[PDB]
Amino acid sequence: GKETITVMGPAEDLDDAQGAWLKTECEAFAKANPDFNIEFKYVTSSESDAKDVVTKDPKAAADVYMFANDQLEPLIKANAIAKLGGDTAEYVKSSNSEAMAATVTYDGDIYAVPYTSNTWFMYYDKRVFSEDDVKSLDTMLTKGKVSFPFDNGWYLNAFYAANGCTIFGDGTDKAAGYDFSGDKGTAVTNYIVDLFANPNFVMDNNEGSLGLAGLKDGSINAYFNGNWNYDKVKEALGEENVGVAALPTINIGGKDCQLKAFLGSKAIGVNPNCKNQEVAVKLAAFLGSEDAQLAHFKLRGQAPVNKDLATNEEVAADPVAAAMAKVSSDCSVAQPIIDMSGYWDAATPFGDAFQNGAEGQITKDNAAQKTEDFNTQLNDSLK
Ligand SMILES: OC[C@H]1O[C@H](O[C@H]2[C@H](O)[C@@H](O)[C@@H](O[C@H]3[C@H](O)[C@@H](O)[C@@H](O)O[C@@H]3CO)O[C@@H]2CO)[C@H](O)[C@@H](O)[C@@H]1O
């Protein structure tokens, strides 16, 4: 009598056309562990949605699931993710950088197995921009069409971080709260107002389907997005036209300021409600193993986090893995694991309010007001 293990991950990992990585690796796990009598059932869900899916009812959720690490604290508070020990915890510490192990560490305990870094970067049309052009957003706007998903807080912050706005201090001090206040914040809001007023800027939609469509028809030539859409970007542009870069500067008041993406991880978590914790924990370890990460790279081009794969020649030569590494070293801030729910929620209507014709449109005349309103809402969400 087989036991059913229910595993949740994104559509791309369950798509046979992309090698169905998650199924492939679950089957490899079973073959490696003949003492287990198991079969698999799969739930399709983006890592970006795992908080909502699992915390609503953990007992109803998958046994093993793929999530984005900023969801860690709400998963813990919902009793929805198991502490990991033993060889699994040791692997997470030994095989990752300190920053990557920290992405899944809460109060000194490991709660998940990283399988890739989680950040974003620039895709661009090499027929439109040069390598030098894409160093500066301002230069780019003089040459071609630029998009950005401003109603997605995971992207929005890069602009505010560029001018010294902070989330929980360095990201780890809850008592510091949010600081988007003052002239430093208004200057960024003003830059974004000017960006929306630029006829070569096109706002991307929240999950980036607009940008992808624009790359294809030529109405957008630069796309800020991530590794998961690498194959779709190659389809849209044609592979010989795909440029991949780290983040540009923006010129605020004559000063070049560096856009800084969040850098976290995507990881495999174990549901405490799973009836076979031994199997679930070993499966999580397997899905984040070196072999499994290499397969993720070969099957659908996802960059590994395991540092022993950093010296793989194919990985080192890959333009997305390279850009992600550059974003890590030069263009990022560590993703807070202090819950940012209030920020994700507030960011979306704030970003939407830059649009021409929007209700309560953010303009030069009200930029300071709207900036303080945002800062106030963020800090109110902590009370
Ligand atoms: O927008 C708020 C949202 O921001 C974060 O979500 C981002 C993910 O962390 C990031 O990995 C990426 O999600 C993609 C998956 O990685 C990918 O496998 C596939 O499923 O597409 C997803 C994008 O559609 O982008 C999202 C932001 O769009 C944060 O983790 C969330 O908790 C937060 O709600």
Short mmCIF file of C-alpha atoms and ligand atoms in Angstrom, two decimals:
data_model
loop_
_atom_site.label_atom_id
_atom_site.label_comp_id
_atom_site.label_asym_id
_atom_site.label_seq_id
_atom_site.Cartn_x
_atom_site.Cartn_y
_atom_site.Cartn_z
CA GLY A 1 0.00 0.00 0.00
CA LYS A 2 1.69 3.15 -1.28
CA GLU A 3 1.57 6.32 0.78
CA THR A 4 0.67 9.48 -1.07
CA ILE A 5 3.03 12.43 -0.80
CA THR A 6 1.51 15.68 -2.11
CA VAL A 7 4.03 18.13 -3.57
CA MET A 8 3.39 21.72 -4.62
CA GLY A 9 5.36 23.82 -7.11
CA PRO A 10 5.01 26.08 -10.12
CA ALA A 11 3.50 25.14 -13.45
CA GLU A 12 6.88 25.33 -15.20
CA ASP A 13 8.28 22.60 -12.95
CA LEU A 14 5.30 20.34 -13.75
CA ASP A 15 5.28 20.96 -17.54
CA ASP A 16 6.53 18.02 -19.59
CA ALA A 17 7.55 20.45 -22.31
CA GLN A 18 10.08 21.87 -19.84
CA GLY A 19 11.22 18.46 -18.55
CA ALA A 20 8.78 18.51 -15.61
CA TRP A 21 11.63 19.01 -13.16
CA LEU A 22 9.59 18.53 -9.99
CA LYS A 23 8.05 15.22 -11.17
CA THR A 24 11.42 14.08 -12.53
CA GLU A 25 13.13 14.75 -9.22
CA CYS A 26 10.35 13.21 -7.08
CA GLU A 27 10.62 10.06 -9.19
CA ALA A 28 14.42 10.08 -8.81
CA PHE A 29 13.97 10.42 -5.04
CA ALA A 30 11.66 7.40 -4.98
CA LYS A 31 14.12 5.35 -7.07
CA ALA A 32 16.94 6.24 -4.65
CA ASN A 33 14.86 5.23 -1.62
CA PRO A 34 13.38 1.77 -2.22
CA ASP A 35 12.58 1.43 1.49
CA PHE A 36 9.85 4.01 0.92
CA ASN A 37 6.58 2.91 -0.61
CA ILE A 38 5.28 6.15 -2.00
CA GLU A 39 3.47 7.78 -4.87
CA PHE A 40 3.18 11.44 -5.70
CA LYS A 41 0.38 13.87 -6.32
CA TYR A 42 1.16 17.36 -7.55
CA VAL A 43 -0.37 20.75 -6.79
CA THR A 44 0.37 23.55 -9.23
CA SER A 45 1.07 26.89 -7.57
CA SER A 46 3.61 29.65 -7.90
CA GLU A 47 6.15 30.12 -5.15
CA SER A 48 4.90 33.73 -5.03
CA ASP A 49 1.51 32.48 -3.81
CA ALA A 50 2.59 29.90 -1.22
CA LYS A 51 1.87 32.03 1.86
CA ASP A 52 -1.73 32.50 0.83
CA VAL A 53 -2.24 28.90 -0.27
CA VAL A 54 -0.68 27.21 2.73
CA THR A 55 -1.42 29.49 5.69
CA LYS A 56 -5.16 29.63 4.94
CA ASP A 57 -5.32 25.97 6.08
CA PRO A 58 -2.04 24.15 6.57
CA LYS A 59 -3.62 20.80 7.21
CA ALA A 60 -5.32 21.03 3.79
CA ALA A 61 -2.06 21.95 2.05
CA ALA A 62 0.63 19.91 0.30
CA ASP A 63 3.12 17.88 2.31
CA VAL A 64 6.14 19.43 0.61
CA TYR A 65 6.07 22.79 -1.17
CA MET A 66 8.15 25.35 -3.01
CA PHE A 67 7.96 28.91 -1.64
CA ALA A 68 9.74 32.30 -1.57
CA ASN A 69 11.65 32.93 1.61
CA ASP A 70 9.99 36.21 2.57
CA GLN A 71 6.98 34.04 3.42
CA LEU A 72 8.92 32.27 6.15
CA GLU A 73 7.68 34.15 9.24
CA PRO A 74 3.99 33.91 8.38
CA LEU A 75 4.44 30.22 7.58
CA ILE A 76 6.06 29.69 10.98
CA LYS A 77 3.37 31.65 12.81
CA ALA A 78 0.73 29.48 11.09
CA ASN A 79 2.53 26.28 12.18
CA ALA A 80 2.80 25.55 8.47
CA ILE A 81 6.50 24.78 8.08
CA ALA A 82 8.65 22.29 9.97
CA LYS A 83 11.97 22.98 11.59
CA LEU A 84 14.72 20.97 9.92
CA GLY A 85 17.62 19.28 11.61
CA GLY A 86 20.12 16.52 11.08
CA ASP A 87 21.79 15.99 7.74
CA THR A 88 19.23 18.24 6.04
CA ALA A 89 20.07 21.28 8.15
CA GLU A 90 23.77 20.46 7.81
CA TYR A 91 23.41 20.43 4.01
CA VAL A 92 21.68 23.80 3.99
CA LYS A 93 24.56 25.27 6.05
CA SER A 94 27.43 23.54 4.23
CA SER A 95 26.32 23.84 0.62
CA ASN A 96 25.17 27.48 0.60
CA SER A 97 26.69 30.85 1.26
CA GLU A 98 26.02 32.45 4.64
CA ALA A 99 23.47 34.80 3.05
CA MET A 100 21.63 31.96 1.37
CA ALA A 101 21.47 29.85 4.51
CA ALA A 102 20.21 32.95 6.36
CA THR A 103 17.25 33.18 4.01
CA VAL A 104 15.69 30.11 5.65
CA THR A 105 16.95 30.64 9.24
CA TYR A 106 14.60 31.94 11.95
CA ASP A 107 15.63 32.31 15.62
CA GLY A 108 18.68 30.20 14.84
CA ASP A 109 16.78 27.24 13.33
CA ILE A 110 16.68 26.12 9.67
CA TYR A 111 13.18 25.79 8.21
CA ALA A 112 13.66 25.02 4.52
CA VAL A 113 16.02 23.82 1.79
CA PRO A 114 17.05 26.53 -0.72
CA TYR A 115 17.07 25.53 -4.38
CA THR A 116 17.75 28.86 -6.12
CA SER A 117 18.44 32.51 -5.34
CA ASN A 118 15.47 34.82 -5.56
CA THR A 119 16.06 38.19 -7.17
CA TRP A 120 15.44 40.02 -10.44
CA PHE A 121 17.45 41.69 -13.16
CA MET A 122 17.21 43.21 -16.67
CA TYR A 123 16.28 41.49 -19.91
CA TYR A 124 16.79 43.71 -22.97
CA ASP A 125 16.78 43.73 -26.75
CA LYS A 126 20.37 43.83 -28.03
CA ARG A 127 19.05 45.31 -31.29
CA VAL A 128 18.05 48.43 -29.32
CA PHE A 129 20.54 48.87 -26.49
CA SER A 130 24.28 48.50 -26.13
CA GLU A 131 26.08 47.12 -23.07
CA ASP A 132 27.00 50.68 -22.16
CA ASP A 133 23.41 51.95 -22.65
CA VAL A 134 21.96 49.59 -20.06
CA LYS A 135 24.23 50.87 -17.28
CA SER A 136 21.82 53.83 -16.87
CA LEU A 137 18.04 53.89 -16.94
CA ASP A 138 18.24 57.50 -18.11
CA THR A 139 20.49 56.60 -21.06
CA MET A 140 18.15 53.76 -21.93
CA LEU A 141 15.10 56.02 -22.13
CA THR A 142 16.85 58.14 -24.77
CA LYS A 143 17.46 55.04 -26.94
CA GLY A 144 14.35 52.87 -26.62
CA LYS A 145 11.33 51.66 -24.69
CA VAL A 146 11.68 50.75 -21.02
CA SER A 147 9.19 49.03 -18.73
CA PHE A 148 8.99 48.45 -14.98
CA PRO A 149 6.36 46.73 -12.77
CA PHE A 150 5.77 49.58 -10.32
CA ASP A 151 2.68 48.12 -8.63
CA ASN A 152 4.72 45.09 -7.48
CA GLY A 153 6.45 45.87 -4.19
CA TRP A 154 9.14 43.28 -4.79
CA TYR A 155 10.34 45.58 -7.62
CA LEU A 156 9.26 49.01 -6.36
CA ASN A 157 11.66 49.08 -3.46
CA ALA A 158 14.71 49.11 -5.71
CA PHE A 159 13.98 52.76 -6.52
CA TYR A 160 13.53 53.83 -2.90
CA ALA A 161 16.50 51.81 -1.62
CA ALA A 162 18.56 53.62 -4.30
CA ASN A 163 18.16 56.89 -2.36
CA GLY A 164 18.53 55.62 1.18
CA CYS A 165 15.05 54.56 2.17
CA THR A 166 15.07 51.56 4.48
CA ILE A 167 13.03 48.58 5.58
CA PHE A 168 13.74 47.50 9.16
CA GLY A 169 17.11 49.27 9.20
CA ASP A 170 19.46 46.93 7.40
CA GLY A 171 16.52 44.55 7.03
CA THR A 172 16.83 42.81 10.38
CA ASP A 173 15.72 45.47 12.92
CA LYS A 174 11.98 45.49 13.36
CA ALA A 175 12.19 48.41 15.85
CA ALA A 176 13.51 50.63 13.05
CA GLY A 177 10.27 50.20 11.08
CA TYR A 178 9.92 51.60 7.58
CA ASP A 179 11.71 54.78 6.52
CA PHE A 180 10.43 56.17 3.23
CA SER A 181 9.99 59.63 4.74
CA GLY A 182 11.31 63.03 3.84
CA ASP A 183 13.08 64.58 0.93
CA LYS A 184 14.99 61.35 0.24
CA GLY A 185 11.69 59.59 -0.42
CA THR A 186 10.03 62.48 -2.25
CA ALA A 187 13.00 62.67 -4.61
CA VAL A 188 12.39 59.04 -5.62
CA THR A 189 8.64 59.61 -5.99
CA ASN A 190 9.43 62.61 -8.18
CA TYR A 191 11.78 60.49 -10.32
CA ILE A 192 9.02 57.93 -10.82
CA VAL A 193 6.46 60.66 -11.67
CA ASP A 194 8.94 61.83 -14.30
CA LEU A 195 9.38 58.28 -15.54
CA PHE A 196 5.61 57.85 -16.06
CA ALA A 197 5.62 61.21 -17.93
CA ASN A 198 8.38 59.92 -20.24
CA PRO A 199 6.93 58.76 -23.53
CA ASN A 200 9.47 55.92 -23.79
CA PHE A 201 8.37 54.45 -20.46
CA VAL A 202 5.69 51.76 -20.34
CA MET A 203 4.41 50.49 -16.98
CA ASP A 204 4.66 46.71 -16.71
CA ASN A 205 1.80 44.83 -15.05
CA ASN A 206 2.17 43.10 -11.70
CA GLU A 207 3.35 39.73 -12.93
CA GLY A 208 5.06 40.88 -16.10
CA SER A 209 2.94 39.43 -18.88
CA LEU A 210 2.68 42.92 -20.36
CA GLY A 211 6.45 43.33 -20.53
CA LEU A 212 6.90 39.93 -22.16
CA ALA A 213 4.25 40.73 -24.79
CA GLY A 214 5.95 44.07 -25.40
CA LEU A 215 9.36 42.51 -25.98
CA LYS A 216 7.75 40.39 -28.68
CA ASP A 217 6.02 43.19 -30.58
CA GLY A 218 8.82 45.72 -29.99
CA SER A 219 6.78 48.22 -27.92
CA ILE A 220 8.98 47.38 -24.88
CA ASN A 221 12.73 46.80 -25.26
CA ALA A 222 13.75 46.35 -21.59
CA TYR A 223 12.04 44.09 -19.09
CA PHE A 224 12.75 43.77 -15.37
CA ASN A 225 11.93 40.26 -14.38
CA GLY A 226 13.51 36.93 -13.40
CA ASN A 227 14.98 33.56 -14.14
CA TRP A 228 11.63 31.78 -14.33
CA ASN A 229 10.83 33.62 -17.62
CA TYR A 230 14.21 33.03 -19.29
CA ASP A 231 12.84 30.66 -21.95
CA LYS A 232 9.83 32.91 -22.63
CA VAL A 233 12.14 35.92 -23.11
CA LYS A 234 14.23 33.90 -25.57
CA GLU A 235 11.03 33.07 -27.46
CA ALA A 236 9.90 36.70 -27.48
CA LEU A 237 13.13 38.30 -28.66
CA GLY A 238 14.89 35.45 -30.38
CA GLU A 239 17.87 34.03 -28.54
CA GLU A 240 20.49 35.98 -30.52
CA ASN A 241 18.81 39.24 -29.42
CA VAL A 242 18.55 38.51 -25.68
CA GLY A 243 20.64 40.73 -23.45
CA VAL A 244 20.81 40.09 -19.70
CA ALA A 245 22.19 42.66 -17.26
CA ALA A 246 22.30 43.63 -13.64
CA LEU A 247 20.52 46.77 -12.52
CA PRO A 248 21.22 50.27 -13.85
CA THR A 249 21.61 53.56 -12.05
CA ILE A 250 19.02 56.30 -11.93
CA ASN A 251 19.94 59.95 -11.86
CA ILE A 252 18.30 61.69 -8.88
CA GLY A 253 19.17 65.39 -8.61
CA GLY A 254 22.36 64.95 -10.58
CA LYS A 255 23.52 61.95 -8.57
CA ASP A 256 23.68 58.45 -10.04
CA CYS A 257 21.90 56.13 -7.62
CA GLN A 258 22.07 52.34 -7.78
CA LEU A 259 18.80 50.41 -8.05
CA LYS A 260 18.83 47.55 -5.53
CA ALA A 261 16.66 44.48 -5.86
CA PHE A 262 15.72 42.25 -2.96
CA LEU A 263 17.85 39.11 -2.74
CA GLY A 264 16.31 36.12 -1.00
CA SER A 265 15.83 32.48 -1.96
CA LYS A 266 13.20 30.07 -3.15
CA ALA A 267 13.17 26.97 -0.95
CA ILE A 268 11.43 23.68 -0.23
CA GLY A 269 9.39 23.51 2.95
CA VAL A 270 7.90 20.59 4.85
CA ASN A 271 4.35 20.76 6.18
CA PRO A 272 4.14 19.71 9.87
CA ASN A 273 0.84 18.06 9.01
CA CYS A 274 2.47 15.56 6.66
CA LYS A 275 1.85 12.06 8.03
CA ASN A 276 5.32 10.86 7.03
CA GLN A 277 7.85 13.40 8.20
CA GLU A 278 10.80 11.09 7.50
CA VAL A 279 9.89 10.90 3.84
CA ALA A 280 8.92 14.59 3.54
CA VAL A 281 12.19 15.86 5.06
CA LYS A 282 14.32 13.56 2.91
CA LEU A 283 12.33 14.60 -0.17
CA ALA A 284 12.93 18.30 0.64
CA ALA A 285 16.63 17.58 1.00
CA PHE A 286 16.59 15.75 -2.32
CA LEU A 287 14.77 18.48 -4.21
CA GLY A 288 17.47 20.93 -3.08
CA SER A 289 20.37 18.53 -3.62
CA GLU A 290 23.24 19.26 -5.96
CA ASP A 291 22.00 16.77 -8.59
CA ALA A 292 18.51 18.25 -8.42
CA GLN A 293 19.77 21.82 -8.78
CA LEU A 294 21.90 20.82 -11.75
CA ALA A 295 18.83 19.20 -13.35
CA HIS A 296 16.86 22.42 -12.74
CA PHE A 297 19.57 24.26 -14.65
CA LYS A 298 19.76 21.78 -17.54
CA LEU A 299 16.02 21.28 -17.92
CA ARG A 300 14.85 24.86 -17.68
CA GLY A 301 17.84 27.12 -17.07
CA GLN A 302 17.27 27.90 -13.41
CA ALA A 303 20.44 29.09 -11.70
CA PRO A 304 21.69 26.94 -8.81
CA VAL A 305 22.31 28.21 -5.31
CA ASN A 306 24.59 25.28 -4.31
CA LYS A 307 28.07 26.79 -4.20
CA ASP A 308 29.70 23.55 -5.58
CA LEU A 309 27.84 24.27 -8.88
CA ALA A 310 29.22 27.84 -9.09
CA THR A 311 32.32 26.45 -10.80
CA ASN A 312 30.34 24.40 -13.33
CA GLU A 313 31.43 25.82 -16.66
CA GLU A 314 27.96 25.91 -18.19
CA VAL A 315 26.58 27.65 -15.12
CA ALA A 316 29.40 30.16 -14.97
CA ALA A 317 28.89 31.01 -18.67
CA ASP A 318 25.12 31.38 -18.44
CA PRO A 319 23.96 34.98 -18.90
CA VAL A 320 21.16 34.75 -16.32
CA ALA A 321 23.29 33.02 -13.68
CA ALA A 322 25.93 35.70 -14.27
CA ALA A 323 23.48 38.57 -14.01
CA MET A 324 21.97 37.15 -10.83
CA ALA A 325 25.43 36.88 -9.32
CA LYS A 326 26.16 40.49 -10.27
CA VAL A 327 22.88 41.61 -8.74
CA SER A 328 23.90 39.74 -5.55
CA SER A 329 27.29 41.42 -5.33
CA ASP A 330 26.51 44.92 -6.66
CA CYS A 331 22.75 45.64 -6.90
CA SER A 332 20.82 44.15 -3.98
CA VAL A 333 19.69 44.25 -0.41
CA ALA A 334 18.97 41.13 1.58
CA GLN A 335 15.29 40.21 1.64
CA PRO A 336 13.92 40.82 5.13
CA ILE A 337 12.37 37.82 6.83
CA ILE A 338 10.55 40.08 9.29
CA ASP A 339 7.04 39.90 7.79
CA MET A 340 6.55 42.53 5.07
CA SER A 341 2.81 41.90 4.49
CA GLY A 342 1.92 45.54 5.03
CA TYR A 343 4.46 46.62 2.45
CA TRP A 344 3.41 44.17 -0.23
CA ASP A 345 -0.19 45.27 0.34
CA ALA A 346 0.47 49.02 0.31
CA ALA A 347 2.91 48.98 -2.56
CA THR A 348 0.41 47.92 -5.18
CA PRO A 349 -2.11 50.81 -4.91
CA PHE A 350 0.83 53.21 -4.48
CA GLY A 351 2.45 52.04 -7.70
CA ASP A 352 -0.88 52.06 -9.54
CA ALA A 353 -1.45 55.68 -8.52
CA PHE A 354 1.42 56.93 -10.73
CA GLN A 355 -0.65 56.14 -13.86
CA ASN A 356 -1.97 58.99 -15.98
CA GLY A 357 -5.62 59.46 -15.10
CA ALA A 358 -5.50 57.44 -11.90
CA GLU A 359 -7.70 58.22 -8.94
CA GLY A 360 -5.48 60.19 -6.60
CA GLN A 361 -2.72 60.29 -9.23
CA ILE A 362 0.75 60.94 -7.84
CA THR A 363 2.13 64.09 -9.42
CA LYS A 364 4.94 66.56 -8.85
CA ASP A 365 2.52 68.77 -6.96
CA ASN A 366 1.56 66.07 -4.43
CA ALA A 367 4.65 63.84 -4.46
CA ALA A 368 5.71 64.77 -0.90
CA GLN A 369 2.18 64.22 0.45
CA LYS A 370 1.84 60.88 -1.29
CA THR A 371 5.29 59.79 -0.11
CA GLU A 372 4.49 60.55 3.51
CA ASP A 373 1.06 58.88 3.12
CA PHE A 374 2.90 55.73 1.97
CA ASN A 375 5.47 55.86 4.77
CA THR A 376 2.64 56.33 7.28
CA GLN A 377 0.64 53.38 5.93
CA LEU A 378 3.72 51.15 6.05
CA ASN A 379 4.44 51.95 9.66
CA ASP A 380 0.76 51.77 10.62
CA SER A 381 0.74 48.19 9.34
CA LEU A 382 3.20 47.32 12.16
CA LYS A 383 0.97 48.52 15.00
O1 LIG B 1 4.40 41.01 -5.40
C1 LIG B 1 4.45 40.60 -4.01
C2 LIG B 1 5.08 39.30 -3.82
O2 LIG B 1 6.59 39.59 -4.10
C3 LIG B 1 7.38 38.21 -4.03
O3 LIG B 1 6.95 37.43 -5.03
C4 LIG B 1 7.92 37.30 -6.12
C5 LIG B 1 8.67 36.01 -6.01
O4 LIG B 1 9.44 36.00 -4.78
C6 LIG B 1 9.55 35.77 -7.19
O5 LIG B 1 10.21 34.47 -7.11
C7 LIG B 1 8.77 35.83 -8.45
O6 LIG B 1 7.80 34.79 -8.46
C8 LIG B 1 7.80 33.99 -9.67
C9 LIG B 1 8.20 32.58 -9.33
O7 LIG B 1 9.57 32.59 -8.83
C10 LIG B 1 8.20 31.75 -10.55
O8 LIG B 1 8.61 30.37 -10.29
C11 LIG B 1 6.84 31.74 -11.21
O9 LIG B 1 5.89 31.11 -10.45
O10 LIG B 1 6.43 33.13 -11.46
C12 LIG B 1 6.43 34.01 -10.31
C13 LIG B 1 6.10 35.37 -10.85
O11 LIG B 1 4.78 35.35 -11.40
O12 LIG B 1 8.08 37.11 -8.55
C14 LIG B 1 7.19 37.38 -7.44
C15 LIG B 1 6.68 38.80 -7.66
O13 LIG B 1 5.93 38.88 -8.87
C16 LIG B 1 7.13 37.68 -2.66
O14 LIG B 1 7.91 36.44 -2.66
C17 LIG B 1 5.71 37.51 -2.43
O15 LIG B 1 5.58 36.80 -1.04
C18 LIG B 1 4.92 38.70 -2.44
O16 LIG B 1 3.49 38.48 -2.24
#
